[PDB]
Amino acid sequence: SMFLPPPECPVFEPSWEEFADPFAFIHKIRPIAEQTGICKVRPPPDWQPPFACDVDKLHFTPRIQRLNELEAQTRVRDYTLRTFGEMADAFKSDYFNMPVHMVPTELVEKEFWRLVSTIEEDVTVEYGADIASKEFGSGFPVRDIKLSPEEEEYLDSGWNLNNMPVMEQSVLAHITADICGMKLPWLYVGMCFSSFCWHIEDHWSYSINYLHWGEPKTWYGVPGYAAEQLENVMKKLAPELFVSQPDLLHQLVTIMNPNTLMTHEVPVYRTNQCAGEFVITFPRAYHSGFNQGFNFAEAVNFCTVDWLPLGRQCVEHYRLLHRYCVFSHDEMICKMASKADVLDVVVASTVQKDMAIMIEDEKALRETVRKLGVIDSERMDFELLPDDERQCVKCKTTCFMSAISCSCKPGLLVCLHHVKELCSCPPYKYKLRYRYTLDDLYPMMNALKLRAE
Ligand SMILES: O=C(Nc1cccnc1)c1cc(Cl)sc1Cl
Ligand SMILES: [Cl-]
Ligand SMILES: [Mn+2]
Ligand SMILES: [Zn+2]
Ligand SMILES: [Zn+2]
């Protein structure tokens, strides 16, 4: 009646040995956690990174939030950490006429789902969300200022989240394209009821989130295999969130009761994440939640070799939906291949397999456009073009392997799936622009094969 909480998600407490290597561990729990979409990770007891900072010297600009179920929010007037905290604590304490630590988590959860479902209640809250900058930086230790020998052990940790993008079992590593939103950590300052709507990460990547201090964060999560069920359910009840958007800052997202999803047979899991705990989201796992009170978290995207085939499927899916890519997947594969001699050996074996599918798809597409009568061709270094200058006019995919142009419409490109969509000139006026000949590609792949023995 009213709110029936979803079953709890898996919890992991690894030993110092298991905990040593982030990617080994995440690869270990993967067959479990991928069935529930999210999971929680408790570090060893002696693992306490030193959060330290001035609550007075760090300023930020707050975002405002209305709390209404099925109402649309867009994915992406000054507070210090101290003045925000004073506001958040007063708010929660006045809402319940209790001292903040005495409000049971069970009750804030029930209350949250009641107030978003009621039209008479116009509750608004505020929060902070921004990538790490100089005006406001990471909660983890970084290099600059001299550091105490404890901050040193934590400085190179796998679980320091400034380090995780740029390690070498991460594939998003050697991307030289700037994808700052997706390589740098984000900082979140929460208060009671401030929330995050149902979403999946760009390019179906993993994410990892650490709560530094404060009151808990409540999460809901759906496993990757149920993603499309969840999307069907959400199209019936809020079809406005699915009207296609002019870009990627304008993706529409919403709050929705997990009981609604459970009624339509979507599996959902919950957890409360407390200070010093990690939550991990797996590829294409939908998730949402809200904060129990004043707190501070930090989070980052990342991609393992596991993910590479889903990254290809996802870019394919983006094309069907005509939505924008954050980076070119093919451009990343080729960049890694061009660094094949310094690649980790299991990485090189996995890239080579994805490159083989890439090449074979590209062969077929080029034969198809040839039989359409496109005859002229010229090499072109796509990676030098700004992204907005190389998106398919039809499906908006970011071009890298190849594209069709026409002197008729200078500057415009279509990918090889949308040759019919550039203009009305006969196909002999068109030109095939291409990064690599088939003959350049096979030696790139061979170098990968050698590296992997
Ligand atoms: O909170 C946010 N995102 C989030 C948080 C935790 C897990 N996944 C996603 C977020 C980012 C914005 Cl920009 S406005 C909000 Cl709200
Ligand atoms: Cl409301
Ligand atoms: Mn997220
Ligand atoms: Zn296209
Ligand atoms: Zn033309």
From Swiss-Prot:
The residues covered by the JmjC domain are 153-319
The record gives the effect of mutating residue 199 to Y as: Abolishes lysine-specific histone demethylase activity
Can you tell me which residues bind Fe cation?
199, 201, 287
In what residue span(s) does the JmjN domain sit? Answer: 9-50
* Tissues of expression: Ubiquitously expressed, with highest levels in testis. Down-regulated in melanoma and glioblastoma. Up-regulated in breast cancer (at protein level).
List where in the cell it is found.
Nucleus
Q: Give the boundaries of each C5HC2 zinc finger.
A: 392-444
Residues where 2-oxoglutarate binds: 127, 207, 209, 217
Disease tied to this entry: Intellectual developmental disorder, autosomal recessive 65: A disorder characterized by significantly below average general intellectual functioning associated with impairments in adaptive behavior and manifested during the developmental period. MRT65 patients have moderate to severe intellectual disability, developmental delay, and facial dysmorphism. Camptodactyly is present in some patients.
What subunit structure does UniProt give? Interacts with FOXG1B, PAX9, MYC, MYCN and RB1. Interacts with HDAC1, HDAC4, HDAC5 and HDAC7. Interacts (via PHD-type 1 zinc finger) with histone H3 unmodified at 'Lys-4'; the interaction is inhibited when histone H3 is methylated at 'Arg-2' or 'Lys-4'.
What protein family is recorded? Belongs to the JARID1 histone demethylase family.
The UniProt function text for this chain reads:
Histone demethylase that demethylates 'Lys-4' of histone H3, thereby playing a central role in histone code. Does not demethylate histone H3 'Lys-9' or H3 'Lys-27'. Demethylates trimethylated, dimethylated and monomethylated H3 'Lys-4'. Acts as a transcriptional corepressor for FOXG1B and PAX9. Favors the proliferation of breast cancer cells by repressing tumor suppressor genes such as BRCA1 and HOXA5. In contrast, may act as a tumor suppressor for melanoma. Represses the CLOCK-BMAL1 heterodimer-mediated transcriptional activation of the core clock component PER2.
What the entry says about domains is: Both the JmjC domain and the JmjN domain are required for enzymatic activity. However ARID and PHD-type 1 domain are not required for activity per se but contributed to recognition of the H3(1-21)K4me2 substrate peptide. The 2 first PHD-type zinc finger domains are required for transcription repression activity.
Can you say what this protein is called?
Lysine-specific demethylase 5B
What is the organism field in this record?
Homo sapiens
Phylogenetic placement of the source organism: Eukaryota, Metazoa, Chordata, Craniata, Vertebrata
Q: Intact protein stretch covered? A: 26 to 753 of 1544
